[PDB]
C-alpha cells in the first residue's frame, strides 16, 4: 500500500511511520514546508501509525531528539512516538478490508487529514486549533496538547480497567475534533475502506 505523506504546514516536520515493534518503510524522514514523501506499507499491516514530529535535531548518524513525537531519539522510527502526537492509525487487509482513523488518545501536536487516494470510502480529519485552545492543565511545555492519561495517569483517563467514560478533557478533544478518537472507549470514528486502498496523510490540511 502507498501512503503519500504531505506537509502543508508552514514549518518543518519529521514524519514518522511505525507499527510499534518495527518501522514502516524507512520509518521517518524530514519534510520541509510543502514536501511530499511517499512510503510503502506492506499489505496486512496491523496497528500501523503515522505522525508528525516537531522541533527535531539529528546528527549525521540519525540520532537526536524531537519536542513532540520523539521515537527513542531516532530519525528513522522503529517504535511509536512520545506524546503529544496526533495519530493517523490503520490496519490493512483485515479480512478483505482496510480500517483507518485519526486519534487524539495520545494528545495532539499537528493538524492532520487522513484520506484514501483510491475509491470506496471517505477520509477523516482533525484540523482545529487544538494546541491554541488546549486546556491549561493539558498544555505540554515542550509543545502540543497532552491527553489526560499522559498528564494524570489515572485508571479513568487511561481506561486501564477497560471501563471508563468520557471526561471533561476527552470532551475538549471531541468538541474540537468530532471525527477523531478522544478516549479509549469513544464511539468509533473508524472508516472502513476497500482492502488494499492507498492513502494520503496531509499535515496542516487547512
Curated annotation (Swiss-Prot):
Family to which this protein belongs: Belongs to the thaumatin family.
Disulfide cysteine pairs (residue numbers): 9-204, 56-66, 71-77, 121-193, 126-177, 134-145, 149-158, 159-164
Function: Taste-modifying protein; intensely sweet-tasting. It is 100000 times sweeter than sucrose on a molar basis.
An example Gene Ontology CC term for this record: cytoplasmic vesicle
Domain of life per record: Eukaryota
Keywords, sorted A to Z: Cytoplasmic vesicle, Disulfide bond, Signal, Taste-modifying protein
Hydrolase in keyword set: no
InterPro entries with a match to the protein in the record: Osmotin/thaumatin-like_sf, Thaumatin, Thaumatin_CS
Record bears the keyword Ribonucleoprotein: no
Entry's localization field: Cytoplasmic vesicle
Protein name per its UniProtKB record: Thaumatin I
